[PDB]
Design a protein around this ligand. Structure first.
Ligand SMILES: [N]
Ligand SMILES: [N]
Ligand SMILES: [N]
Ligand SMILES: [N]
Ligand SMILES: [Pt+2]
Ligand SMILES: [Pt+2]
Length: 676
């Protein structure tokens, strides 16, 4: 129950010691305790932790990566934050600030002028140059020389002036102090403001510190990695790297990440920001930034599924990977690299394998355990593309993936050129009960296609989450039929299945499915949740079943969102959400290549191929819906609809968003930590 904290100096050990003493008093025997193991460097601390000699140490982003690498394999567990609970700011963003309409992008930096905070600074030097690595001329070592040949002129504080003079061009001498007017953050900025340099590699917050006026800031933009610009205000969407300010790391396995959190949670409570004046956790008596940066306002728990690569982000792990590995390709600059497709079943792998060979190597395959694991691989570039349901397009979206292609199910000559946007989720109710509107749903009887089903459970409960604001959905409706709910709940009370199939989500339920929930409606229901065309196909003598024969369209009215009721054929206007198609999801950088390859592939192996027994086709599975849903005819392009928020309905998002409050995703909780 003793967390062995690691000290890198004698000063740190002292603070650790008092931190052992003060936590000793305020904590009962049944509580966390601190040990003080004293090594000589952060590296030594990393090796100590991994060798199970220490338990936790807090590191700068650079060492967070070092800790991740074999054989240490250490992971972020706790984060320092630098604001409030509502404004944590555990991360920063290395950016590239430029003049407005200076007329160039990230891939057009060769032969420009640059302003750096200082050589060896992360945001100012390491991150930019790291990204820029493959564009530098040979030889790239020494790094100073290659960057000198890259930019026409530069201000690189602390750079070797005598040897590589072009790095001092903007600030001769390359003064490594505030003497140099172009040194530091504000200095790297006024290097740009004075028009001496074309681009300044600073922090997202730098611009705000120098120019107080919203007016002046408007003549400045940011270079985004996708070779677009954006306002200085949208840094979270236009940064070169998101960097964790301070992070505690422990062993990936048996690290005691709970012991650590338990300790630091109580430590920040008793001795946190101002909450004591006998001992300050974030105040160093003999020095500054002992154990923790004095900036720190408190701690946050890092979600469990977070690995270092995920925490740092692909951009950051690209930069340093380049600086260290220094391995650039020589593959043609124009041509697209093979797209690694993600498979999550053994058959999915087998199908992907067949595809891959027939794709003449233009498609490659990667096996992963979960769907969430696949998304993680796309994120950190262990894979390229995969298809996701609406609910996973969301999760991937909050993780900074993008929909690119949508699965089209309705045969259409020029389908490739028209996305579908799926069907319409509706809440139907008998016309007779005029009292029934969206609001007074509380306590009524209900009918669901099933629990987990899109239109029957997801959108309804997701929207009606605001009206309940807890995770006991059965307590909303007095009684209902939700096939799959606990046999004993109130959502199983209106299900007319005999025996074992009493409340099971199968055909023998009879109150299951789209038709089934409508029978639940027509007989003993106050509301049913079905698609738009469920009423038209189950009425007007289209259904020769007993209960359905003589049911008519006029008799039922679907309920709307604003409180109104509408007729069945006005579903277009009276809907809950637009339950979406499955979509191909990829990383922003691989968007172009994926659009290309998949379009070519669906020509060769698409729906347009017969004799599917003599030639491979992409849309026929051995078992069921491998890689793509079998109902697919083509993969439509998503120009204009190429974000998660723009592909999924604002409504759909609200629903799934609310639902994910009750049902947690270890991946979703991770991505939302990085981007809330
Ligand atoms: N492990
Ligand atoms: N592991
Ligand atoms: N029934
Ligand atoms: N029934
Ligand atoms: Pt493990
Ligand atoms: Pt029945």
């Amino acid at each position: 129950k003793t967390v062995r904290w690691c000290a890198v100096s004698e000063h740190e050990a002292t603070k650790c010691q008092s931190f052992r003493d003060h936590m000793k008093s305020v904590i009962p025997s049944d509580g966390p305790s601190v040990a003080c193991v004293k090594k000589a460097s952060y590296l030594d601390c990393i090796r100590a932790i991994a060798a199970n000699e220490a338990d936790a140490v807090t590191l700068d982003a650079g060492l967070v990566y070092d800790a991740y690498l074999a054989p240490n394999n250490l992971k972020p567990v706790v984060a320092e934050f630098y604001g409030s609970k509502e404004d944590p700011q555990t991360f920063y963003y290395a950016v590239a600030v430029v003049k407005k309409d200076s007329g160039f992008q990230m891939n057009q930096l060769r032969g420009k002028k640059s302003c750096h905070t200082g050589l060896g600074r992360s945001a100012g030097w390491n991150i930019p140059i790291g990204l820029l690595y493959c564009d530098l001329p040979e030889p790239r070592k020494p790094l100073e020389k290659a960057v000198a040949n890259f930019f026409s002129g530069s201000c690189a504080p602390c750079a070797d002036g005598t040897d590589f003079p072009q790095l001092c061009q903007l600030c001769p001498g390359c003064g490594c102090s505030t003497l140099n007017q172009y040194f530091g953050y504000s200095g790297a900025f006024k290097c740009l403001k004075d028009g001496a340099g074309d681009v300044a590699f600073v922090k997202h917050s730098t611009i705000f510190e120098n120019l107080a006026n919203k007016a002046d800031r408007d003549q400045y933009e940011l270079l985004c990695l996708d070779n677009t610009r954006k306002p200085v205000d949208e840094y979270k969407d236009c940064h070169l790297a998101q960097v964790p300010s301070h992070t505690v790391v422990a062993r990936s396995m048996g690290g005691k990440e709970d012991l650590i959190w338990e300790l630091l949670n109580q430590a920040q409570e008793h001795f946190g920001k101002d909450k004591s004046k006998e001992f300050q956790l974030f105040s160093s008596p003999h020095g500054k930034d002992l154990l923790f940066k004095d900036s720190a306002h408190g701690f946050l728990k890092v979600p469990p599924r977070m690995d270092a690569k995920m925490y740092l982000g692909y951009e950051y792990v690209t930069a340093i990977r380049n600086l260290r590995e220094g391995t650039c390709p020589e593959a043609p600059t124009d041509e697209c690299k093979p797209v690694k497709w993600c498979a999550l079943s053994h058959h999915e792998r087998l199908k992907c394998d067949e595809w891959s060979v027939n794709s003449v190597g233009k498609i490659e395959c990667v096996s992963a355990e979960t769907t969430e694991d696949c998304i993680a691989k796309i994120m950190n570039g262990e894979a390229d593309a995969m298809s996701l349901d609406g609910g996973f397009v969301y999760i991937a979206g909050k993780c900074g993936l993008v929909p690119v292609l949508a699965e089209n199910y309705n045969k259409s000559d020029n389908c490739e050129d028209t996305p579908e946007a799926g069907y319409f989720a509706v809440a139907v109710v008998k016309k007779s009960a005029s009292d029934l509107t969206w609001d007074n749903l509380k306590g009524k009887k209900s009918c669901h296609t099933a629990v987990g089903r899109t239109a029957g459970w997801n959108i309804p409960m997701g929207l009606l989450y605001n009206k309940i604001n807890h995770c006991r959905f059965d307590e909303f409706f007095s009684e209902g039929c939700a096939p799959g709910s606990k046999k004993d709940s109130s959502l199983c009370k209106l299900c007319m299945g005999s025996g074992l199939n009493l409340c099971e989500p199968n055909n023998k339920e009879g109150y299951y499915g789209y038709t089934g929930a409508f029978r639940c409606l027509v007989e003993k229901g106050d509301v049913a949740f079905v698609k738009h065309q469920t009423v038209p196909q189950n009425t007007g003598g289209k259904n020769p079943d007993p209960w359905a024969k003589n049911l008519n369209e006029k008799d039922y009215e679907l309920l709307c969102l604003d409180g109104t009721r509408k007729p069945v054929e006005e579903y277009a206007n009276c809907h809950l959400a637009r339950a979406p198609n499955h979509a191909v999801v990829t990383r922003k950088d691989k968007e172009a290549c994926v659009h290309k390859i998949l379009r070519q592939q669906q020509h060769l192996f698409g729906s347009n191929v017969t004799d599917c027994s003599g030639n491979f086709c992409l849309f026929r599975s051995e078992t069921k819906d491998l890689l793509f849903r079998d109902d697919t005819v083509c993969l439509a392009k998503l120009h204009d609809r190429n974000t998660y928020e723009k592909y999924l309905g604002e409504e759909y998002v609200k629903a799934v968003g609310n639902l994910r409050k009750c049902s947690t995703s270890s991946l979703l909780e991770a991505c939302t930590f990085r981007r809330p």
